Ligand SMILES: *[C@@H]1O[C@H](CO)[C@@H](O[C@@H]2O[C@H](CO)[C@@H](O[C@@H]3O[C@H](CO[C@H]4O[C@H](CO[C@H]5O[C@H](CO)[C@@H](O)[C@H](O)[C@@H]5O)[C@@H](O)[C@H](O[C@H]5O[C@H](CO)[C@@H](O)[C@H](O)[C@@H]5O)[C@@H]4O)[C@@H](O)[C@H](O[C@H]4O[C@H](CO)[C@@H](O)[C@H](O)[C@@H]4O)[C@@H]3O)[C@H](O)[C@H]2NC(C)=O)[C@H](O)[C@H]1NC(C)=O
Ligand SMILES: *[C@@H]1O[C@H](CO)[C@@H](O[C@@H]2O[C@H](CO)[C@@H](O[C@@H]3O[C@H](CO[C@H]4O[C@H](CO)[C@@H](O)[C@H](O)[C@@H]4O)[C@@H](O)[C@H](O[C@H]4O[C@H](CO)[C@@H](O)[C@H](O)[C@@H]4O)[C@@H]3O)[C@H](O)[C@H]2NC(C)=O)[C@H](O)[C@H]1NC(C)=O
């Protein structure tokens with residue numbers, strides 16, 4: 001309609017973002033984004049990370065993004081099928097089985113996938 | 126925007142559907158639909174099931190849908206958070222840990238989630 005994104009979603013450059021108000025493990029967070037016809041957040045580079053983090057007020061809160069550890073392939077894999085291609089995100093913590101990536105306003109963390117935290121969905125413009 | 130659905134997608138009543146041409150285990154199929162800003166297929170009732178199956182040519186091919194076995198409740202659960210609420214799907218096979226639901230032209234089957242088969246994504250009009 002008037003603006004680019006659905007009501008309640010925040011535009012950032014060429015995406016619309018939804019920050020959740022409730023918590024979930026990573027697999028449920030993926031299911032929620034898919035239910036909302038959307039992707040878990042994908043982050044291209046440090047520039048995108050910083051601008052996304054700049055939307056967040058509370059520095060302590062963690063949010064799932066669409067990146068987790070593929071044990072068979074021994075590397076971080078985006079839900080879009082691509083492996084993580086740099087160290088731009090500077091993930092803090094262990095690259096191991098049943099780990100998933102979260103972000104805060106300040107940092108990027110490996111967290112166990114069962115951890116219940118908020119999540120960010122995106123829709124591309 | 127001549128027609129309702131994106132190119133390659135098939136309209137069916139008030140949805141756009143995408144039948145995959147490659148295979149994946151169920152979790153990766155969910156990740157694909159989410160990447161495509163879409164849900165794994167949800168099926169309301171027998172009528173939707175039959176109308177969707179009517180789109181399938183090959184009688185031998187299975188497609189994941191957005192329904193799997195949630196161990197805590199021992200119940201089939203849709204990815205939108207709701208539990209299965211009829212027997213309209215007449216699910217064949219066992220309701221047990223690590224099972225997910227697939228459809229063929231003729232039937233609805235419980236399959237192990239790791240099984241590599243096609244999948245169906247949807248967008249609501
Ligand atoms: C799933 O989602 C994920 C997340 O969104 C997505 O992953 C991102 O995918 C994109 C696209 O593939 C990645 O971006 C690409 O990055 C390539 C690598 O870029 C880095 O390295 C470049 C080369 O550096 C070396 O060589 C040069 C000499 O040539 C030298 O100077 C260097 O010192 C070094 O030795 C480098 O140029 C590049 O630097 C530029 O960009 C950075 C951004 O951080 C910035 O400092 C400046 O802008 C600088 O100029 C960077 O360090 C890159 O080659 C590639 O670029 C080509 O493609 C794009 C478009 O795709 C064109 O714009 C460009 O002209 C080139 O043709 C592209 O930018 C990105 O890194 C991923 N991010 C992560 C975190 O994984 C997946 O793709 C998604 N998958 C699907 C299927 O959708
Ligand atoms: C997640 O996605 C799924 C799939 O699309 C949705 O699941 C459907 O949800 C709808 C709406 O809640 C369900 O519809 C309900 O089905 C009940 C069971 O009906 C069958 O079984 C009885 C057996 O006696 C038959 O009589 C009946 O004909 C069906 O074969 C109904 O009882 C419900 O009835 C409604 O109307 C009646 C009369 O008007 C009243 O009792 C109530 O007012 C009631 O509203 C209702 O029709 C449907 O069964 C679900 N399908 C499946 C396969 O699970 C989820 O809704 C969706 N979730 C979210 C959050 O979006």
Ligand SMILES: *[C@@H]1O[C@H](CO)[C@@H](O)[C@H](O)[C@H]1NC(C)=O
Pocket residue numbers: 068069070071072073077079150152153156
């Ligand atoms: C799905 O599960 C397999 C094995 O458990 C794993 O290798 C794959 O990366 C998972 N996919 C996603 C998107 O989490």
Ligand SMILES: *[C@@H]1O[C@H](CO)[C@@H](O)[C@H](O)[C@H]1NC(C)=O
Pocket residue numbers: 025027028031193194195196197202204
């Ligand atoms: C996520 O995993 C949990 C624990 O295994 C399970 O209860 C839940 O139903 C899963 N979600 C989906 C969408 O499969």
